[PDB]
Amino acid sequence: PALKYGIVLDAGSSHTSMFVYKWPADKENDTGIVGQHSSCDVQGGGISSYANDPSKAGQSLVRCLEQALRDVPRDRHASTPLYLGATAGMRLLNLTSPEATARVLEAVTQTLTQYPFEFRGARILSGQDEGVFGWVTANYLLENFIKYGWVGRWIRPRKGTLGAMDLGGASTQITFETTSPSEDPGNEVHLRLYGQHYRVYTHSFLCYGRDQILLRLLASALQIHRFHPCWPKGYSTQVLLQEVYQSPCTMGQRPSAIVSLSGTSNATLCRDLVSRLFNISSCPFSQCSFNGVFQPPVAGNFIAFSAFYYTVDFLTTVMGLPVGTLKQLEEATEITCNQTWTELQARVPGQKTRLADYCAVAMFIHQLLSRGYHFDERSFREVVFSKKAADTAVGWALGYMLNLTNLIPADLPGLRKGTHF
Ligand SMILES: Cc1cccc(Nc2cc(S(=O)(=O)O)c(N)c3c2C(=O)c2ccccc2C3=O)c1
Numbered sequence: 001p002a003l004k005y006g007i008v009l010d011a012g013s014s015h016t017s018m019f020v021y022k023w024p025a026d027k028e029n030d031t032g033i034v035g036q037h038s039s040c041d042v043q044g045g046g047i048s049s050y051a052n053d054p055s056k057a058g059q060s061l062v063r064c065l066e067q068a069l070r071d072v073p074r075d076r077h078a079s080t081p082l083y084l085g086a087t088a089g090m091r092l093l094n095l096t097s098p099e100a101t102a103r104v105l106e107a108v109t110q111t112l113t114q115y116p117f118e119f120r121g122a123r124i125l126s127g128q129d130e131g132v133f134g135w136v137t138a139n140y141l142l143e144n145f146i147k148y149g150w151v152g153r154w155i156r157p158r159k160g161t162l163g164a165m166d167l168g169g170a171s172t173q174i175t176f177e178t179t180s181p182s183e184d185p186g187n188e189v190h191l192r193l194y195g196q197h198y199r200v201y202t203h204s205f206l207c208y209g210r211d212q213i214l215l216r217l218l219a220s221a222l223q224i225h226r227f228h229p230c231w232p233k234g235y236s237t238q239v240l241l242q243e244v245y246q247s248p249c250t251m252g253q254r255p256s257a258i259v260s261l262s263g264t265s266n267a268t269l270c271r272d273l274v275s276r277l278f279n280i281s282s283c284p285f286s287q288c289s290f291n292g293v294f295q296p297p298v299a300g301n302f303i304a305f306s307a308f309y310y311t312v313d314f315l316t317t318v319m320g321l322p323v324g325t326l327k328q329l330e331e332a333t334e335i336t337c338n339q340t341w342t343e344l345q346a347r348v349p350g351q352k353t354r355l356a357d358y359c360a361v362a363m364f365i366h367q368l369l370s371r372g373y374h375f376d377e378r379s380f381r382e383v384v385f386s387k388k389a390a391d392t393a394v395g396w397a398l399g400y401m402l403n404l405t406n407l408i409p410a411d412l413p414g415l416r417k418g419t420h421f
Pocket residue numbers: 012015017041167168210306307308310311314
């Protein structure tokens with residue numbers, strides 16, 4: 001059983017992950033056949049955190065690269081393609097300093113070319129790529145692209161597809177198959193997968209990832225309240241003003257060089273702070289999500305992964321609270337946000353370095369779903385929070401790999417004698 005391999009570096013905003021995929025040479029074109037072989041998490045920040053010292057971006061990857069040398073058998077190395085894709089962190093760096101951004105890419109390129117894998121390039125994904133490839137990953141792994149039934153009795157309608165909601169560090173994406181007419185070409189996607197047309201909606205909200213949201217809520221709290229209602233009572237920190245406003249996401253909020261900001265465990269005021277992130281006041285289309293962006297109604301099942309999954313896992317596994325309904329999700333965030341700092345710490349016996357931020361991130365998810373995308377009780381119950389399908393991390397990495405390696409055919413071998421006609 002001869003296996004081929006492929007590696008993707010997912011250079012996210014606050015960190016980098018490497019995923020190695022494997023698949024039998026013989027059957028590489030069946031849907032769901034590629035699975036994850038191993039992965040590795042790179043220590044320290046994302047490649048964009050090295051703008052001021054671009055050689056370290058490259059170097060940060062060495063340890064995970066060595067692991068890849070070990071995970072992929074030595075005689076497959078040279079025919080194993082290697083890709084790096086970078087997301088909103090490098091898109092944000094691109095607005096700040098396209099030159100710093102260019103040096104970061106060159107530095108990772110130089111490190112990755114030293115390795116004996118088939119290096120295929122370091123690129124920044126568009127926001128459309130990042131949402132569409134995550135939708136691909138999830139539906140590929142769950143075999144939603146198979147045509148179900150048999151001759152003379154095909155399943156009708158066609159097998160439904162899973163929508164994808166990805167919460168990264170610096171943007172968030174929503175992508176799903178829709179029947180609604182398109183009102184904006186920027187959001188419109190057409191795929192031809194295994195002989196089938198999939199009409200797909202996608203949008204990436206830059207500056208709406210987990211970390212940039214936290215930064216914006218902090219600047220917003222500082223300006224409206226002088227206390228942080230999303231932070232727990234008894235928690236405080238000295239905020240350096242200059243750093244709060246340095247991100248493209250917060251510089252629009254820039255108004256004694258250090259200010260002490262204390263939490264108040266205030267779920268109401270936290271929810272009000274979060275709801276101001278979603279500008280729902282204008283819509284130049286028939287219908288919108290927020291900030292004037294076209295969005296047809298959400299429909300079908302969704303997988304919500306990356307930070308959606310980890311935040312909900314915290315609510316259920318560590319807070320011990322149900323989240324099966326929007327209402328229950330809302331209640332879970334209230335209870336979480338109302339914990340004092342000592343109460344919250346007492347429920348987590350480990351080292352949680354970002355414990356004070358769970359309240360805000362949870363409030364953010366609840367409002368993004370309800371006020372942003374307009375899930376309600378009925379549609380929310382088709383949302384599954386999961387980080388994994390078929391032994392593979394759900395992300396855009398796999399779909400990106402499948403696409404650049406050309407492992408999903410547009411049509412079927414022989415057009416399957418044309419019986420999906
Ligand atoms: C790949 C990997 C390996 C070991 C630990 C983690 N933990 C995480 C990995 C990711 S990732 O960026 O989606 O990869 C991630 N987004 C998160 C975590 C988290 O542990 C996490 C915890 C609490 C809130 C949010 C997150 C979170 O978003 C991720």
